[PDB]
Structure 1
Amino acid sequence: HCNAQMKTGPYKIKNLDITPPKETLQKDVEITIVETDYNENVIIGYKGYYQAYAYNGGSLDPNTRVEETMKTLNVGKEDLLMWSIRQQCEVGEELIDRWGSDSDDCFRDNEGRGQWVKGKELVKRQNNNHFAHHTCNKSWRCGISTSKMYSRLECQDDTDECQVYILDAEGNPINVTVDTVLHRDGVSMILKQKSTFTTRQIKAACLLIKDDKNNPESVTREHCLIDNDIYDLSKNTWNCKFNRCIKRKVEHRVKKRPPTWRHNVRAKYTEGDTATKGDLMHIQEELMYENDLLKMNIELMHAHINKLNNMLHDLIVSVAKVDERLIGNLMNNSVSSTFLSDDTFLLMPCTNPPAHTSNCYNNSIYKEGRWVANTDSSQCIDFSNYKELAIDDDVEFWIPTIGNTTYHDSWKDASGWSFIAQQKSNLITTMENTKFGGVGTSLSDITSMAEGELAAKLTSFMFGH
């Protein structure tokens, strides 16, 4: 039980320092790197509306009917351009519960002109109130934005031309270009400046690696260390994935490797002389010194790894207080933990249901990483094939799609700690105003005392008071 105070201070965390090893290899080889730079240069736009024309008066006349139409209008090229620069839809006016006798604005105005909105979702409603006259209802839909769909870089020609492929999810490219109608899936898209990229030259260190480590006089090929990986650059061809391409030209050479020395075989260097024991001792001392340097580097790396391990264990032991399934997850087991103190804790086993294809077990649902009871009959997602992504993969998707499905974004659908953050104030108000305690017992009965007894009191007043 500590104390809060008025003493604070602004701060910002700085990453731990990792000292580099001493005597880094000399970098003497040039490498050509080509990758796509950063630019949005995409537009996505759409627009729709609603219609509802109804009439009555006979209950069997064909004019006595109700109708509704789905009509989505494609958006023009300059229309999209100025929707982008102006961030507004060239949308039409909205007519609500309009008596149709002399106002044909719901029949002569279909293209949609004049109204500029930040974005509008159409609403479906009908009107059939005029028992003898006509009436009409209208709605509208807006959409415009920019996007950054992830793209791959391809440089296959030996003539060194490169051009991006703006591909959609699942890995398929989509034929997209400036000032050409696409108008697919009820959306229209425009991109500016096509796309650009950069080229640069970087020095690196390269060595010749034997193919067969257990075969003397084997085949060797060049390898270079670029950022944190060793690439094979034996052939002077472009080799790349994602959007970053690597190339090593042929004029830049790689130092050769001497073959193993053995007696009864000529030893490359031809200088007839006499070797003395002092030379042997000198060479031996030099090589011992080199081994000493390598050992020092090894020890430095070991110290770094030890520091990281200690930090990670402290992190997990601190976090485990909130998440009680962390220890079991790290142990490939199924247990839950409760802490008696800051370092001591207990354990408690859990079971595992059989394999299943969804997240529903007969009034049980999976949410927030736990299995809880459920009463909503229809909230169940059937599992299908799944994509597979790594952390390093950028794959910025922001995929465009128009949704016209019933499911809504009600506040009750919030993930972990979003619910708490959003409802902290409401929960505080509920606890405070409703002063929890044994005072309010209106819950002990049904609405009978609320309505019928109040009506009885009102009648009592009226006819006796």
Structure 2
Amino acid sequence: HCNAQMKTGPYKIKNLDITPPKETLQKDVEITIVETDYNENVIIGYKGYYQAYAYNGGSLDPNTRVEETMKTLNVGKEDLLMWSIRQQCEVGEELIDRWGSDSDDCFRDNEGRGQWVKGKELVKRQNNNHFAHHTCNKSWRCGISTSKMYSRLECQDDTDECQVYILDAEGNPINVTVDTVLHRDGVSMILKQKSTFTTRQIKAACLLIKDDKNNPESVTREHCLIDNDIYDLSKNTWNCKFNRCIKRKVEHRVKKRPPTWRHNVRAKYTEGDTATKGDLMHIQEELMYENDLLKMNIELMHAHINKLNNMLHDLIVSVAKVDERLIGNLMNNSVSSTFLSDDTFLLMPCTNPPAHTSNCYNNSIYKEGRWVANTDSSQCIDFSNYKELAIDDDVEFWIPTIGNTTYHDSWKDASGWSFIAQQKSNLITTMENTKFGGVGTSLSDITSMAEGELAAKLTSFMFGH
């Protein structure tokens, strides 16, 4: 068992340093690059409130009840623009435990005015212990943010004009009206300041590659390195993906590749002299030194790779404690692991169900990456065709369209570690308030005893008095 203390200190993580190889090539070829400018120019806002009305009006009576309603409101153009300018909400008043005898303030305000905040989350609470009167509570909601628009850039060859397209969820161009309000799924969105691009020139290093490697006197084409990929720029045409385009003009050329030297064939320019052994040895020594430099670069790269490998293994070993299926997944097997210490562990195998087109197996469901027993009759999804994406695909997820304005969700449908984070306080309260042990015993009967014996005792006392 370790110990926890009061000593701390603020910190931030800095990336590991990678030393570039020495003696880099010379960049002397100009490349034209066109890409869209970075600009959010999308506004998102929402607002809502929660209300509860209660009136025990005593007990053992039908005059008792606590009804609650949740509402979502739209946001106007002027309000949303003013919020974007001020980066704040304009929201109503908070009511907590208001006695209902002359205070029914939860019935006179429905828009929400007076208070400006940078963001607020509603909390719901119910308390109706005052029998002789009414009670009501009210809470409010805030939200304001910006996001970038899903876009794409394309250019033509015969005219050299470029245009920017606005894409939907599936990636298709669509008409969007600028400076207007759209409501869908309980949020309001506005688009403004249509996107623009820019052009610049970048120096790069290029060489000639042979198409056929094991055949001399073959066809060669130009290749250049831009960021992490080698592009074929033999042809002077636009070629690009997403929003970044590459072009090499005709006038900018590349140094020619000398042919192989052989006897019986004239060797380029003629310089009539007699060579000596010293020149050959000088050339040999220079080339050996160059090879030595290349070798040193090789060991540097190898050391970097080894360091990364060690770091990755330490990472996986540390992380495997929480996720018990990581080791099996990395082995392309189906086992689960439990740890006896920080170094040693055990293994335990599972089976694999037959292939299926859904996530339901006769009262079994797949959730949170695990198969568990299920009793919900209707919670099943039929598998359809899937798309595939990489980490660097530059995809956005906010689209200003029209649709249903009704919204509904539940706190029970929380993903991994979001449920725990959201319900930690409630779990702590439940655990502390209920003193778990061998004292609670009102669970051995049915709901009859709540009213039966109580009313019978009341009547017995009344006619015995």
Query: Deviation of residue 378 (structure 1)?
Result: 1.1
**Which has the higher mean CA deviation after the structures are superposed, 171-180 or 253-262?**
171-180
Query: Measured at CA, do residues 5 and 64 of structure 1 come closer, stay the same or move farther in structure 2, by a change above 3 Å?
Result: closer
1:208-254 residue CA offsets vs partner (Å, 9 max, x unmatched): 11111011011111110000000011111211110001111122111
**Which has the higher mean CA deviation after the structures are superposed, 285-294 or 198-207?**
198-207
Corresponding residue for residue 398 of structure 1: 398
Query: Deviation of residue 41 (structure 1)?
Result: 3.0
Q: Is the 8 A contact 2:185 2:406 kept in 1?
A: no
Query: Deviation of residue 40 (structure 1)?
Result: 2.7
Query: Deviation of residue 194 (structure 1)?
Result: 2.2
Taking only the aligned residue pairs, the percentage that are identical comes to 100
Corresponding residue for residue 135 of structure 1: 135
CA distance in 1, matches of 2:186, 2:209: 55
Query: Measured at CA, do residues 316 and 138 of structure 1 come closer, stay the same or move farther in structure 2, by a change above 3 Å?
Result: closer
1:30-62 residue CA offsets vs partner (Å, 9 max, x unmatched): 111110111133468999999999999999999
**Which has the higher mean CA deviation after the structures are superposed, 118-127 or 449-458?**
118-127
Query: Measured at CA, do residues 123 and 426 of structure 1 come closer, stay the same or move farther in structure 2, by a change above 3 Å?
Result: closer
Corresponding residue for residue 217 of structure 1: 217
RMSD over aligned Cα, in angstroms?
Answer: 7.6
Query: Measured at CA, do residues 161 and 189 of structure 1 come closer, stay the same or move farther in structure 2, by a change above 3 Å?
Result: farther
Query: Measured at CA, do residues 279 and 319 of structure 1 come closer, stay the same or move farther in structure 2, by a change above 3 Å?
Result: same
Query: Measured at CA, do residues 110 and 423 of structure 1 come closer, stay the same or move farther in structure 2, by a change above 3 Å?
Result: closer
The SS at the match of 2:302 is: helix
How many residues in Structure 1 have an aligned counterpart in Structure 2? 465
Query: Measured at CA, do residues 98 and 326 of structure 1 come closer, stay the same or move farther in structure 2, by a change above 3 Å?
Result: closer
Corresponding residue for residue 190 of structure 1: 190
1:409-450 residue CA offsets vs partner (Å, 9 max, x unmatched): 211111111111111111111111100000111001112222
CA distance in 2, matches of 1:43, 1:149: 10
CA distance in 2, matches of 1:68, 1:105: 15
CA distance in 2, matches of 1:161, 1:145: 33
CA distance in 2, matches of 1:45, 1:419: 25
Query: Deviation of residue 148 (structure 1)?
Result: 2.9
**Which has the higher mean CA deviation after the structures are superposed, 121-130 or 232-241?**
121-130
CA distance in 2, matches of 1:197, 1:242: 13
Query: Measured at CA, do residues 248 and 60 of structure 1 come closer, stay the same or move farther in structure 2, by a change above 3 Å?
Result: farther
1:388-415 residue CA offsets vs partner (Å, 9 max, x unmatched): 1100111112234666599832111111
Mark the runs of 5 or more structure 2 residues left unpaired by the alignment: none
TM-score normalised according to structure 2 size: 0.78
Corresponding residue for residue 453 of structure 2: 453
Mark the runs of 5 or more structure 1 residues left unpaired by the alignment: none
CA distance in 2, matches of 1:142, 1:155: 42
Q: Is the 8 A contact 2:33 2:244 kept in 1?
A: yes
1:97-145 residue CA offsets vs partner (Å, 9 max, x unmatched): 9999999999999999999999999999999999999999999999998
Query: Deviation of residue 269 (structure 1)?
Result: 2.4
CA distance in 1, matches of 2:80, 2:287: 71
**Which has the higher mean CA deviation after the structures are superposed, 417-426 or 120-129?**
120-129
1:137-166 residue CA offsets vs partner (Å, 9 max, x unmatched): 999999998653311101114433211000
CA distance in 1, matches of 2:61, 2:460: 53
Alignment of 1:225-236 (within 5 A): 225-236=225-236
Q: Is the 8 A contact 1:32 1:248 kept in 2?
A: yes
CA distance in 2, matches of 1:238, 1:196: 19
CA distance in 2, matches of 1:17, 1:83: 42
Query: Measured at CA, do residues 403 and 362 of structure 1 come closer, stay the same or move farther in structure 2, by a change above 3 Å?
Result: farther
Query: Measured at CA, do residues 323 and 247 of structure 1 come closer, stay the same or move farther in structure 2, by a change above 3 Å?
Result: same
CA distance in 2, matches of 1:153, 1:349: 50
Query: Measured at CA, do residues 96 and 159 of structure 1 come closer, stay the same or move farther in structure 2, by a change above 3 Å?
Result: farther
Query: Measured at CA, do residues 276 and 55 of structure 1 come closer, stay the same or move farther in structure 2, by a change above 3 Å?
Result: closer
Query: Measured at CA, do residues 33 and 443 of structure 1 come closer, stay the same or move farther in structure 2, by a change above 3 Å?
Result: same
Query: Measured at CA, do residues 23 and 59 of structure 1 come closer, stay the same or move farther in structure 2, by a change above 3 Å?
Result: closer
CA distance in 2, matches of 1:366, 1:140: 36
Query: Deviation of residue 90 (structure 1)?
Result: 14
Corresponding residue for residue 374 of structure 2: 374
Q: Is the 8 A contact 1:177 1:190 kept in 2?
A: no
Given the alignment of the two structures, is residue 150 of structure 1 paired with residue 150 of structure 2, yes or no?
A: yes
Q: Is the 8 A contact 2:45 2:188 kept in 1?
A: yes
Q: Is the 8 A contact 2:52 2:66 kept in 1?
A: yes
Query: Measured at CA, do residues 188 and 282 of structure 1 come closer, stay the same or move farther in structure 2, by a change above 3 Å?
Result: same
Q: Is the 8 A contact 2:97 2:137 kept in 1?
A: yes
CA distance in 2, matches of 1:130, 1:431: 28
The SS at the match of 1:190 is: strand
The SS at the match of 1:169 is: coil
Q: Is the 8 A contact 2:120 2:141 kept in 1?
A: yes
Query: Measured at CA, do residues 114 and 155 of structure 1 come closer, stay the same or move farther in structure 2, by a change above 3 Å?
Result: farther
CA distance in 1, matches of 2:10, 2:143: 41
Query: Deviation of residue 177 (structure 1)?
Result: 5.1
CA distance in 2, matches of 1:425, 1:96: 20
